[PDB]
Amino acid sequence: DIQMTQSPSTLSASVGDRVTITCKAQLSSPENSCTHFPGNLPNMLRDLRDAFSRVKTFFQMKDQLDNLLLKESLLEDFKGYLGCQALSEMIQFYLEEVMPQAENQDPDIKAHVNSLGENLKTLRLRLRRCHRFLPCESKAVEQVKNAFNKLQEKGIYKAMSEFDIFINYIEAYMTMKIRNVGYMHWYQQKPGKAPKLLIYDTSKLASGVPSRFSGSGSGTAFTLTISSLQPDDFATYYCFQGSGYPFTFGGGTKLEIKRTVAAPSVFIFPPSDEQLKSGTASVVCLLNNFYPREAKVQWKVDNALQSGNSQESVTEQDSKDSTYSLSSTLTLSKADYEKHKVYACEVTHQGLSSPVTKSFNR
């Protein structure tokens, strides 16, 4: 279970500014499904250790040497950048160069070694089926192979005696991989529309995404940077993870674009005759293309300030000029509406030096 803390939750920046959205990952400890695969990895390590425990003495006694073959240099490779390639090379080494010739003595030993090899093959297939563990995308393995070559017959015995160490290295690699997110992806969503792939594989630009966007990060910290903000970058941005089931998203960042103060144009619409026939009267006040979003719209019916009988609605920020529009609808019963004469909408906004009133007489 991988969760993503995304910050800031909301953000308001100016054209040309540089904005960084952070997605911090938090992990939680989790047969033929990927959903329970990294939770079932300890069980495969258990199967491997049991089977090898039943042959360890035979091979440690048959190998009468004392030079460690799998040195920690191999583990340094495993947990490094090319660790995937190192691990799969080691798996192939054991499956093709050591195990076919080690399993042919007693039926008991043969059964145990064949179970070890079958688990290695099944692990290879599963890593390949799930979350892009395989295929990948190392002088220690070369040294292992060279020593094994020099050791002729005794080499197989040596590698089989150190299979426990090999198991531990596999365990360390898988533990490092599951305590980290391989890739972070990013989606951009415009209001009322499906998300659009913005960045994938942590740093790659999706289709139609300009150079202004970039991605970065590793392990548990990831970032999405817009170097030069543009009016069309208004949106909600979500980081997304496909490295583990369930797939999860960030909390999201809503991004508004700052611009110069623009005063609204105020219009007023009286109720239609068609609606008045039905027993209701709706008076609509329209504030068109203004910035910032904050505006004060009050209804006055025969100079009486109204309360509780109007609802506002405001558009999402314009992706071109960065402005808003707002409607305020005053709803009355027809009888109530005909008890009065003057209907006024009064607008206070930063772009207006004094409040603007649009009114009409019934």
């Binding site: 499904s33 890739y183 998300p195 960030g250 619409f269 239609s272 609606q275």
Partner: protein
């Protein structure tokens, strides 16, 4: 590139089962490595992954709502079905299907999404009223006019102008939930003042949840 389209009821009652259908083209769920998944978004909340299915018929579900989810595919018909049992008002959301790939493990193409409301209330079509232009809706060489789409349920509703011939200058406001439990919105458009006595302005409102189609002429 590829295209996906969701379809399902706009309204289901509490405890009923939602059946969502994804229809896709440009790819095949017989193609090795291919996958389809479902994601939802409640009003004003984050995206939440629901489920997926792969070409090898393996399925995966979000534990936060499993026991209630069933995904299936019909590759001959290019369709994926999601079933959500025992629906709750907290499941009110927009549901998307999206394509993914064994080389990808992210959703690169999404459908438009479809809106689902869980409520005991019944569907109701809107009333359309003109917001008539006049001297009080003019500003320079411009005049605003519109349509009030009132008292409908559930979401969504769509508004065009002059059968789509008039697109520039249109602001269709997000619906507000009224104390009656019914939705209401307005669609406004600014036009050249000089065109009011010549050009006819008609708003075309469509409420698919109620099989409602209305055309309202907006006269000065």
């Amino acid at each position: 590139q590829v295209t996906l389209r969701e379809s399902g009821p706009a309204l289901v009652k509490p405890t009923q089962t939602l059946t969502l259908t994804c229809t896709f083209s440009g790819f095949s769920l017989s193609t090795s490595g291919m996958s389809v998944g479902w994601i939802r978004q409640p009003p004003g909340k984050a995206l939440e992954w629901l489920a997926d299915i792969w070409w090898d018929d393996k399925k995966d579900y979000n534990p936060s709502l499993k026991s209630r989810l069933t995904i299936s595919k019909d590759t001959s018909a290019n369709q994926v079905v999601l079933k959500v049992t025992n629906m709750d008002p907290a499941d009110t959301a927009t549901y998307y299907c999206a394509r993914s790939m064994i080389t990808n493990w992210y959703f690169d193409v999404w459908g438009a999404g479809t809106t689902v409301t869980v409520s005991s209330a019944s569907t109701k079509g809107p009333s359309v009223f003109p917001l008539a232009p006049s001297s009080k809706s003019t500003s320079g060489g411009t005049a605003a006019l519109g349509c009030l789409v009132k008292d409908y349920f559930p979401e969504p509703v769509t508004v065009s102008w002059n059968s789509g011939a008039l697109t520039s200058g249109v602001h269709t406001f997000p619906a507000v939930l009224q104390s009656s439990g019914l939705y209401s919105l307005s669609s406004v458009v600014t036009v050249p003042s000089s065109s009011l006595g010549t050009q006819t302005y008609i708003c075309n409102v469509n409420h698919k949840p109620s099989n409602t189609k209305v055309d309202k002429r907006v006269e000065p």
